[PDB]
Amino acid sequence: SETVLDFMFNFYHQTEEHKFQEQVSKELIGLVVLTKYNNKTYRVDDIDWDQNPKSTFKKADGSEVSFLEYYRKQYNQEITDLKQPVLVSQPKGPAMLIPELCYLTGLT
Amino acid sequence: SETVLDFMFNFYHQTEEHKFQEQVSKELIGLVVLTKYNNKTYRVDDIDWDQNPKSTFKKADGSEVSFLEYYRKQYNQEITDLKQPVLVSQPKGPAMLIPELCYLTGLT
RNA sequence: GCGAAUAUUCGCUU
RNA sequence: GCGAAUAUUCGCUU
Numbered sequence: 001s002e003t004v005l006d007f008m009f010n011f012y013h014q015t016e017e018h019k020f021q022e023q024v025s026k027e028l029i030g031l032v033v034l035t036k037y038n039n040k041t042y043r044v045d046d047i048d049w050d051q052n053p054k055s056t057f058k059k060a061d062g063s064e065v066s067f068l069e070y071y072r073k074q075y076n077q078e079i080t081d082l083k084q085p086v087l088v089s090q091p092k093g094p095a096m097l098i099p100e101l102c103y104l105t106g107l108t
Numbered sequence: 109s110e111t112v113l114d115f116m117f118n119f120y121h122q123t124e125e126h127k128f129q130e131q132v133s134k135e136l137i138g139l140v141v142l143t144k145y146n147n148k149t150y151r152v153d154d155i156d157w158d159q160n161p162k163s164t165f166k167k168a169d170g171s172e173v174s175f176l177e178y179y180r181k182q183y184n185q186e187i188t189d190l191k192q193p194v195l196v197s198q199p200k201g202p203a204m205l206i207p208e209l210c211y212l213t214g215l216t
Numbered sequence: 217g218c219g220a221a222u223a224u225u226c227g228c229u230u
Numbered sequence: 231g232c233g234a235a236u237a238u239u240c241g242c243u244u
Contacts, residue, residue, distance in 0.1 A: 015123035039217035
């Protein structure tokens with residue numbers, strides 16, 4: 001089962017940086033992704049190109065951790081690619097998902 | 109630690125298919141790679157663009173398994189990207205290495 | 217679904 | 231280095 005990161009460099013190939021980001025945004029935004037470390041599905045409704053796996057967030061307990069730290073400590077999932085963007089899913093404080101750690105699904 | 113697959117789509121970006129394969133070949137052939145499932149290092153001395161993770165090989169016992177099957181059964185390592193090539197390392201019957209499952213090293 | 221710990225056996229070039 | 235099994239506790243939106 002291919003990951004969202006695998007999809008990004010397999011679905012459409014583009015040498016233009018801005019055209020790559022607009023095409024990837026058009027292809028992914030709306031799809032439901034399944035995380036490989038927790039059996040939860042999320043609807044990806046945005047892609048944060050200003051964040052990467054070294055970016056940090058605030059936990060429910062109020063401590064700050066990087067995405068690298070979070071998934072290593074919580075699920076023992078080692079993120080290898082540091083240049084990838086972070087997907088964002090809005091509920092109801094959005095969930096920031098790593099493309100390398102998410103499977104694809106045909107969805108609305 | 110970035111993988112060889114991560115390297116392929118981060119080191120040099122090329123829209124031309126043949127130029128991508130020649131540049132990747134030039135950049136990788138000669139480097140020593142470390143597999144993340146077994147603490148062994150291999151010198152990559154060729155890239156087999158005619159093989160992928162669904163390709164099969166003959167085991168020491170003489171049974172035929174795909175690369176997907178091998179690493180799932182032997183090391184519980186799930187290969188997600190099916191379009192990637194297979195690296196080849198010659199000894200002394202070469203070892204066929206999956207880019208997704210290999211870390212990089214500065215080497216001769 | 218992915219992990220952690222302790223104990224006891226195990227598998228591993230491709 | 232990555233795993234497997236059995237048993238006993240555990241952690242998990244980001």
